[PDB]
């Protein structure tokens, strides 16, 4: 109960003076301008609809001054009347202004004018003359040929574009580049019209030989947006070529993935996996150009946070999807891995690509122990002919889930006399760029902590305070996560998990982090097919209750 007129009475004058500037978009500049502003116009009309619906016609005169001129100007512009719902709302506004029982001649004139403009929308013969004449003879109404004609109109145009593509450097008939840009502007307001989809796919695949961009960026954005909300459903080759010709559209698409992992679906990796596979990014990222730019936006996010676990998991999912699509669809002549991951020793990647589904559960220790050795070489023995640094070898290692998370659980499986190389790998995970004094201090703390935990596990089901003693910093998240892995692993868990979780969940950030952790872990288990049903049911119940605290 605050404004009710003011913002709207301003927007009214803005839009009315703009419609007056526009009307019918018979030029270039009116067209580009309409296609831009149209989306807001739609919202303006929804608000206007709400306003006129709640009240009634012919009695009140609030904005009845120029509502007529506004709706007319709107209707004769066809880039407005072809956008998503504009027409349906414009009908509604005129249905409200009608009157059942006119008294003064103004109400009758209004109703007549309304019938006139509605008829112009629905049923006016502004089309070619001879084609109109031909049909009446055969006894056809507009409706029962409009569809085929459109269909047959579209296919024509698509062929011409198809032919212009093959005539690259040929003495004939060059499709005038003005018309290609024109079509690109005309497809934009009506992308959610199913009858035109054939035209889009042809425009995107038929790039042409012209070195300048012949399509205008209002077109790329509309297609891109519409692929991501699933309102157009193109085929994959079209979206890959859109990504490859308009890099700011690939940024706006990969940001729309980061909103998916930050806002809507935090730490539900099944909905992220579903989204990524359904989106085409994995299929598109088989192209080295797109994987270097998609990977660069992940790095920017990896640095802005100082190693957020939520980003890491998304990267792991993405990389797992990407792998079985690089594999799936490049039999002979595929790109060499130093071309996607160009900084590290290729050796290392070649190791980390090997899926742990393929390996027996018992031989994971050997493989990790080897990887650790080669990673230690690549970071600490930083000589020429190697990585750029520790961060880069880290950023690689992060891409491959499976390996990075099984580490603690293998230390617990070999908790008696932990191997120092695994301790090294784990300490390296939670912090690189530390220096040996830090890494050593962390490792010896961790070894002492593991000494405490093996003793506590082989003991009975004990309290949570005994755990806060050893927990009691820069090395907290490592110990926290190791202790959570201990809870899920040890059969002493499922009794005292809550006692530790409540105390550990100081803030909301640690809670969210632990939720993420547990989701990642169950995703990882269900993927690798490694499971103890105690931990599965335990983690599911804990996750259920922690999703309530938020």
């Amino acid at each position: 109960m605050a404004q009710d007129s003011v913002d709207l009475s301003c927007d009214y004058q803005f839009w009315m003076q703009k419609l007056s500037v526009w009307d019918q978009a018979s030029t270039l500049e009116t067209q580009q301008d309409t296609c831009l502003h149209v989306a807001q116009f739609q919202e303006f009309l929804r608000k206007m609809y709400e306003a006129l619906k709640e009240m009634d016609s012919n009695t009140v005169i609030e904005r009845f001054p120029t509502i007529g001129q506004l709706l007319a100007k709107a209707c004769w512009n066809p880039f407005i009347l072809a956008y998503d719902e504009s027409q349906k709302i414009l009908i509604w506004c005129l249905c409200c202004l009608i009157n059942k029982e006119p008294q003064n001649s103004g109400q009758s004139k209004l109703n007549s004018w309304i019938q006139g403009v509605l008829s112009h929308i629905l049923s006016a013969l502004r089309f070619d003359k001879e084609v109109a004449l031909f049909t009446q003879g055969l006894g056809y109404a507009p409706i029962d040929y409009y569809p085929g004609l459109l269909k047959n109109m579209v296919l024509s145009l698509a062929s011409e574009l198809r032919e212009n593509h093959l005539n690259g450097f040929n003495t004939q008939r060059r499709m005038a580049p003005e018309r290609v840009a024109s079509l690109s502007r005309v497809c934009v307001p009506l992308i959610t019209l199913t009858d035109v989809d054939p035209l889009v796919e042809a425009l995107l695949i038929c790039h042409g030989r012209e070195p300048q961009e012949i399509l205008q960026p209002e077109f790329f954005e509309a297609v891109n947006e519409a692929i991501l909300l699933k309102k157009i459903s193109l085929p994959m080759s079209a979206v890959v070529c859109l990504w490859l010709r308009h890099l700011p559209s690939l940024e706006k698409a990969m940001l729309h993935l980061f909103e998916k992992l930050i806002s809507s679906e935090r730490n539900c990796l099944r909905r992220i996996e579903c989204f990524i596979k359904d989106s085409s990014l994995p299929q598109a990222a088989c192209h080295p150009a797109i994987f270097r730019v998609v990977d660069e936006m992940f790095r920017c996010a990896l640095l802005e946070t100082d190693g957020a676990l939520e980003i890491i998991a998304t990267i792991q999912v993405f990389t797992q999807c990407f792998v079985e699509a690089l594999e799936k669809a490049s039999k002979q002549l595929r790109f060499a891995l130093k071309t996607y991951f160009p900084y590290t020793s290729p050796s290392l990647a070649m190791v980390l690509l090997q899926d742990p589904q393929d390996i027996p559960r018992g031989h994971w220790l050997q493989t990790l122990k080897h990887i650790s050795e080669l990673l230690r070489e690549a970071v600490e023995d930083q000589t020429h002919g190697s990585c750029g640094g520790p961060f880069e070898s880290w950023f690689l290692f992060i891409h491959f889930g499976g390996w990075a998370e099984m580490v603690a659980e293998q230390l617990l499986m070999s908790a008696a006399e932990p191997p120092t190389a695994l301790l090294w790998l784990l300490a390296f995970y939670y912090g690189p760029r530390d220096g040996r004094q830090q890494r050593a201090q962390t490792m010896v703390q961790v070894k002492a902590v593991l000494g405490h935990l093996l003793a506590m596990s082989r003991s009975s089901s004990l309290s949570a305070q005994d755990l806060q003693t050893v927990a009691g910093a820069p090395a907290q998240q490592l110990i926290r996560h190791l202790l959570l892995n201990f809870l899920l692993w040890a059969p002493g868990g499922h009794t005292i998990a809550w006692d530790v979780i409540t105390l550990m969940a100081h803030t909301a950030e640690i809670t969210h982090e632990i939720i993420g952790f547990l989701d990642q872990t169950l995703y990882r288990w269900n993927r690798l097919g490694i499971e103890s049903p105690r931990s599965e049911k335990l983690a599911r119940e804990l996750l259920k209750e922690l999703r309530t605290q938020v």
Binding site: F169, N170, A336, P346, M350, Q354, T367, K369, H370
Partner: protein, 370 residues
């Protein structure tokens, strides 16, 4: 300057106005230390929409091709000064492209010094010299006994600027050139770089000897990849790192999905057993736990029977069927790939259901009947 009173003097000094009303200019126009004859005529008024411009045959052969641009500039350019600025630029470009025909070195320094320097190297070295004496190529040996060539391309001023060095081997070759340096210097750096990469070479030499390398056939010295064949109708391709050859390679498998899978599994299990102290072969054999054939078929290798445009067998039911009418190519194609290609080229002409064009690989007459 701005106005065409001192700026025209300063920017085209050897154009002299003949007429008092400055309408006819005659003289020379300069470009890269070379003066070209030029004679210009305006109308009674200062409009270039119509003007005469004659040149010497020197200047026309060099402004060959750009004739339409110049003709256009005559009509489009507002002032004479800007038209001359543009034509000197343009002339520079036409000269810089065909730099082959237009040059002269400074002999007193050049030809003698280069021959003194090739004597300082030793005439055992030199293997090739170009008639323009621009490109020369020298040879060196490995301690292992391998020949490696180096191409230099020399400018008009050799000792002044760097000469462009082109070499085969796969790490980027870096040559510290000074104005004091000479061919002996860069040659000593080249021998140093050779001796560095010895180990990579040893690896690839051992492989190409004791195994059926397949598709780097007669491989270069740049080549890091070796598609090795094993068993039958399956291969493992192997890329090696030059700095760390003995280190584990990038390897993966082409062929039958049912044969390769157990191999990938066995690899996964043995990868920890890799050791960069043995040989690549001596490591791979015990890692993948199999032996190789030593040239199981030498005659009928996998002659690539793929589209040679799309590089696939099985494009949409279609087979590589359309082939080349040539003994040296014999390259199959697809209808669709080869139709979309030939409809592109400018040379091609289409009868009723036939297109005649050039084979992509060998540029010989090839016919396609739809």
């Amino acid at each position: 300057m701005a106005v065409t009173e001192a700026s025209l003097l300063r920017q085209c000094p050897l154009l002299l106005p003949q007429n008092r009303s400055k309408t006819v200019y005659e003289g020379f126009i300069s470009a890269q230390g070379r003066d070209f004859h030029l004679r210009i005529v305006l109308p009674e008024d200062l409009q270039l929409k119509n003007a005469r411009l004659l040149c010497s045959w020197q200047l026309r052969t060099i402004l060959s091709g750009y004739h339409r641009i110049v003709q256009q500039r005559m009509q489009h350019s507002p002032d004479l000064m800007s038209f001359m600025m543009e034509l000197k630029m343009l002339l520079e470009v036409a000269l810089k492209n065909r730099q082959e025909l237009y040059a002269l070195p400074p002999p007193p320094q050049f030809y003698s010094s280069l021959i003194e320097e090739i004597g300082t190297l030793g005439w055992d070295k030199l293997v090739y010299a170009d008639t323009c004496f621009s490109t020369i190529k020298l040879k060196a040996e490995d301690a292992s006994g391998r020949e490696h060539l180096i191409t230099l391309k020399l400018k008009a001023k050799y000792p002044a600027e760097s000469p462009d060095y082109f070499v085969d081997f796969p790490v980027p070759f870096c040559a510290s050139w000074t104005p004091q340096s000479s061919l002996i210097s860069i040659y000593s750096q080249f021998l140093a770089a050779i001796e560095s990469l010895k180990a990579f070479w040893d690896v690839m030499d051992e492989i190409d000897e004791k195994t059926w390398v397949l598709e780097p056939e007669k491989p270069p010295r740049s080549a890091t990849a070796r598609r090795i064949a094993l068993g039958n109708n399956v291969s493992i391709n192997i890329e090696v790192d030059p700095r760390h050859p003995t280190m584990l390679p990038e390897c993966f498998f082409l062929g039958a999905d049912h044969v390769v899978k157990p191999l990938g599994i066995k690899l996964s299990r043995n990868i920890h057993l890799w050791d960069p102290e043995n040989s690549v072969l001596q490591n791979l054999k015990d890692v993948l736990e199999i032996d190789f054939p030593a040239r199981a078929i030498l005659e009928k290798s996998d002659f690539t029977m793929d589209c040679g445009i799309c590089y696939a067998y099985q494009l949409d039911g279609t087979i590589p069927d359309q082939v080349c009418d040539n003994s040296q190519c014999g390259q199959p194609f697809h209808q669709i790939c080869l139709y979309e290609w030939l409809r592109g080229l400018l040379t091609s002409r289409q009868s009723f259901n036939i297109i005649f064009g050039e084979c992509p690989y060998c540029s010989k007459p090839i016919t396609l009947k739809m």
